[PDB]
Amino acid sequence: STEVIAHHWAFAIFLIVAIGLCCLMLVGGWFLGGRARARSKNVPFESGRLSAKFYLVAMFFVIFDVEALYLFAWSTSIRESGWVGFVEAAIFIFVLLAGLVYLVRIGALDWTP
């Protein structure tokens, strides 16, 4: 149809013009304005080892994001799945919340010592 390909063209123009807009913003910022040198200019501004809890938080985000994708697939087809799929998703969320409670109680989600 004509409408769908016009929508595709409009979306392509949107993405291309946005990317070109930020690219031209960079081009204008870099090209314009005078430049001058200082001795400590190139030194990073520092007002004149990382813990494993960051990895644990990102890991929990990954795992619960995969279970979130499962619930994403469930949520768009809730009525056709019926009460049986509701029971399956209740078991799924029960396992999810049991794992979450287990993570909470052993201090995995506790940032402070």
Partner 1 sequence: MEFAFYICGLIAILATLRVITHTNPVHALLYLIISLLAISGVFFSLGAYFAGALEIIVYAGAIMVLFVFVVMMLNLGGSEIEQERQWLKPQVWIGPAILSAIMLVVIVYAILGVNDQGIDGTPISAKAVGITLFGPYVLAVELASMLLLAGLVVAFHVGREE
Partner 2 sequence: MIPLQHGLILAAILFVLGLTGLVIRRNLLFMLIGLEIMINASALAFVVAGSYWGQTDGQVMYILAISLAAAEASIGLALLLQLHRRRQNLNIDSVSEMRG
Partner 3 sequence: MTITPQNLIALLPLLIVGLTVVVVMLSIAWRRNHFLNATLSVIGLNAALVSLWFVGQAGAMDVTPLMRVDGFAMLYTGLVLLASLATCTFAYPWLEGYNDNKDEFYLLVLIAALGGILLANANHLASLFLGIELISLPLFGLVGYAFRQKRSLEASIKYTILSAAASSFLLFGMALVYAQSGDLSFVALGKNLGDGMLNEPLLLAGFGLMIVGLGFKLSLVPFHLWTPDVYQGAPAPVSTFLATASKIAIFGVVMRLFLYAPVGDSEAIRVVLAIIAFASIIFGNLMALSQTNIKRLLGYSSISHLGYLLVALIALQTGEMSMEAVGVYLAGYLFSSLGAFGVVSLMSSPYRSYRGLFWHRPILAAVMTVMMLSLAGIPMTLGFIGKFYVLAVGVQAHLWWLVGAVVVGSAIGLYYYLRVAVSLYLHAPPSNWQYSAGGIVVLISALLVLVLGVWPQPLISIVRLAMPLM
Contact residues toward partner 3 (CB under 8 A) are 84, 94-95, 98-99, 101-102, 104-106
Task: Select from partner 2, partner 3, partner 1, none the partner in contact with residue 16, using the beta carbon and a kind-dependent cut-off of 5 to 8 Å.
Answer: none
Of 8-16, 25-33, 57-65, 98-106, the window that binds partner 2 (rule: CB under 8 A) is 57-65
* CA quadruple 69, 73, 79, 85: dihedral sign: negative
How far apart are alpha carbons 49 and 59 in whole angstroms?
Answer: 19
Q: Which is nearer to ligand 3PE, 91 or 104 (CB)?
A: 104
Binders of ligand 3PE among residues 13 to 32 (CB under 6 A) are 15-16, 19
**Residues that bind partner 1 in the complex, under the rule CB under 8 A:** 49-56, 58-63, 65-67, 69-70, 72-77, 80-81, 84-85, 88-89, 91-92, 95-96, 99, 103, 108
Residues that bind ligand 3PE (CB under 6 A): 4-5, 8, 11-12, 15-16, 19
